[model samples]
Target: SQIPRLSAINDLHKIWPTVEEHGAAIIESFLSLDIVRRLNEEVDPFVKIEPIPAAKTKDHPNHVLSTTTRLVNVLAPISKAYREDVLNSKVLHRICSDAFHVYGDYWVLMGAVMELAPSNPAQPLHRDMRFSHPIVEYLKPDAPATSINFLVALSPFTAENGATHVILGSHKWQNLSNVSMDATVRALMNPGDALLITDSTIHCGGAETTGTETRRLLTITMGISQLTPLESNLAVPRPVIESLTPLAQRLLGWASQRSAAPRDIGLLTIRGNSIEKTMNLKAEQPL
Candidate 1:
């Protein structure tokens, strides 16, 4: 199936398979305008003073004036409305379950709001799962996705304002080095829209924002239970963890790593109630 722009959860069943085949999918107004407004209010102040960190390597260049503010665990302080309406939505759950073909054991590796300052250069094309040597070597033409990312638009995403660029069907490429811009498409979306990309997809943020407005995006990354999170969420304060709902706590990694067994093995041996008890115990541990 061709990549589709879906407006409702029911539309997902038909298009979910395309994520693996085409590498990404779009959901228009997946989030409501009110949520976007609240997120902007919460994230605006931090972007003002936060220094833009240097790029990890020179291989990925940036514009001289671009700045980014990362809000770690953004769902923690936002509000119950955001938690229930956005983070814990049925649409997200369905899409995630279908994309990974897993029952419900996925964990969020990281959640952050990135504000790309005006004049930011297009980031070099790359894959989010390229960090680990084992993953890089193991990925092939038909490997299952290692991670999934949702980029929720807090502001308009346009070509002039630096929409993301994705290489369609690049997930099937045996050698991503051969991929180029010629095969890419811009993720043009409005506030409240979301772009979901599988980990194996070749993609990058577009550069050269001629528009005056800074591009704001909320990024949520989820992976199979065995993969380690990019952020050290275990180090977040205990009070913060205690304040979250059981599902939120699990997604943030309190119970994500307690069992080493695969999802199938763990489900077979561990009762659902036992898993909840284990998660509560793990959450009570010292940070």
Candidate 2:
């Protein structure tokens, strides 16, 4: 109760009334060109399969091509550059901190790179917080948000290449059963651009990549630190965990105390001599 509530704003301190009003914000050029290029290179070898079953769409001509999971761990050793770029992004960090308020210290619930193959169809509009359906049905308008998402473009997102679509302000609605495409807005972006969204927002992925190339993106989901991650970072190898920076380790939940600690204890209570025995706290140089 002592911590101040986080007010929604961009890195420039520009208040994004749209986020509070519409439930989404577009952070253009969120990543550097060098980082974008490096990310593409890191995911290249892993994006070989076409018609990824996990993101499959019924009755759609277009489909997901490939995807790489556990991105933070996968890229840590091969490209510390992208890992740091994502973890230390000022805009991402600040926005999440503000959106969640006192519970703002988030853990990456899941991280993946999704490549939409050419000719894929648009996805059905839905909320990212669908797992909370029964509970969401009862949530009041003033209730705190549970999660947030970041969809970063690795390739250009155009109408021709299939950008994501979102319903403006649907998050405020108690019932979205009748929401239609008429409210949709395309999130057109270039490589390195990011779309930050509240999980309650109604949104969908675009379909039909008429362009010559496939559209690629990195999807990162973050939830309150108290919740369980969709993927357990604990399953990650000790060697890989050891390779991460102190900040990265904390973000991955390694530094999190299993039981509650004093607010002043901070998240990195396992530091000092103990941390070094399990993992190197020293920051690694970017590749």
Candidate 3:
């Protein structure tokens, strides 16, 4: 079934318009299944290590539940496919330029492995832009987007397996008055399919009904700079940042956007302060 209503097309050119007009679109085969398998394989080792606690999850719901939702944070340091194929996805990044172009500079807000197990409850339909709510709620209608979100499917996403539910064109809605289960639509994806949306789009993780198919999604949420990122690269040891490509390091929030335009609001690390910048400037590796 074509759930998003917007066709899931493989053409790279349609990515932006679909997201702009419909608020969400699926880029078919954004990742090859082999990369999908490799990413899933990478996370298998972390499954037993990082499940969520019930109370803490309930206190602050990120829309999805913690009980059956498995989130692992070290993907940047562990997976090759994550760094190369997913985070640096060429087509997705190109559209990102158009989507957040008005902002001038944007950085990866957070990236991780999110797996919603069977029976995981449906998340309330919400806009992720609210993560920066105190600031975002002030935004005017059709204002420049503060962020873009991409949920890359690492496994088949089916109706029973918790595909994401999104409201078409909700990105233009200034309020949630129109949001409801009936107003939303599900995006069923293949192993490599990636669902792209403006952070303001209304959406949620659909509940898994089959009790067997676990939905594995690679999360790459990007946000405009000069705002607090949900996750920090500093928490990741400095040396590990070296292993990542410069783009990954920048996306991880290590490179200050001011470095590009006239220097303002410079971000610095410990030591000489120019340390990470100097490191980042070391040289680009041949792809």
Candidate 4:
């Protein structure tokens, strides 16, 4: 294994240690094959192959670009398996909490399915933390992480099939420069496996070399409760929201929790509480 590898069952205790050491780790069988299939089946219609314009190159090199043929909104709004199982996985929550809970509570940074169409190019080496958290560069030795990222494989992954690439432990760099691509390694995962990394980790989806291979992945990013998620604000119908577990409802932005600082963490509030209390606020006649 190019990175720390663990069994989601036997080695659940080792994820934080692995990440602390390597900035990333792979959890094999993070989900059952059956659950992975359910997620894929629900999102089949939402995915499509088309040109997506994401600037992969930044001031340094082409390292800051993002483009995808993806379902860019929360999969929870459309996939039952995603809403009930993957999004509700307490193990995922524990990993996030362990990494950044200086706040003791965390929020979803992103929850989306990314499908890399054939021939997509590899992303340049870049730290995901650079975009939103400038403090990523100045943390003290004792400061906990500001973020954690989870990339779950939904299909077979190989270098030719656009497996994700990472430079293990590169997140500590002050800035990105002419980093040699040879140092990077592909995550090389199987369906149901998950690659978890620290926010500052430098990684990207590998280029799909196989003429017909498609890479599908679910990426969940967690930040301390101080931040909101990055998913496009697409409306999930009221009926749909009502059926979700309380945890799902909160993670999807339906509610809020008090932070260690004693302030409510979520932005959408009805009067002085979580927006979820006003269930009457329904999308006018769902389609």
| Tens-place lDDT digits, model 2, residues 244-266 | 66667666776653323444444
Model-by-model lDDT, in order?
Answer: 0.69, 0.65, 0.73, 0.73
> How many Å off is the CA of 240 in candidate 1?
3.5
List where candidate 1 sits over 4 angstroms from the true fold: 1-3, 55-84, 102-104, 132-136, 256-287
Best prediction by TM-score = 3
CA deviation > 4 Å runs, candidate 3: 1-10, 53-64, 131-133, 259-276, 279-287
lDDT of 1: 0.69
TM-score of each: 0.80, 0.76, 0.84, 0.83
lDDT of model 2 at residue 209? 58
Badly placed stretches (over 4 Å) of model 2 are 1-11, 15-17, 49-51, 54-78, 131-140, 209-211, 257-287
Instruction: For model 1, give the 10-residue run with minimal summed lDDT.
Output: 60-69
- Which candidate, 1 or 3, has the higher lDDT? 3
Clashes of each: 2, 7, 0, 3
- lDDT tens digits by residue: candidate 1, 1-287: 33458775657675567677678888888888897888778666765645555445534333332444333344554444454456576777777777665434677776777877777778778777565425545656566776788989889998888899998888777766677877788898989898888887788888745846688888888776667666655566666666556666677665533333464345322464454565454333322
Model 1 scores a TM of: 0.80
- Identify the runs in model 4 with alpha carbons over 4 angstroms from their true place: 49-68, 129-142, 175-178, 232-234, 262-287
Model 3 agreement with the true structure over 40-91: per-residue lDDT tens digits:
8887888657647344544544544557887766466677778667667787
Pairwise lDDT winner, candidates 2 and 4:
4
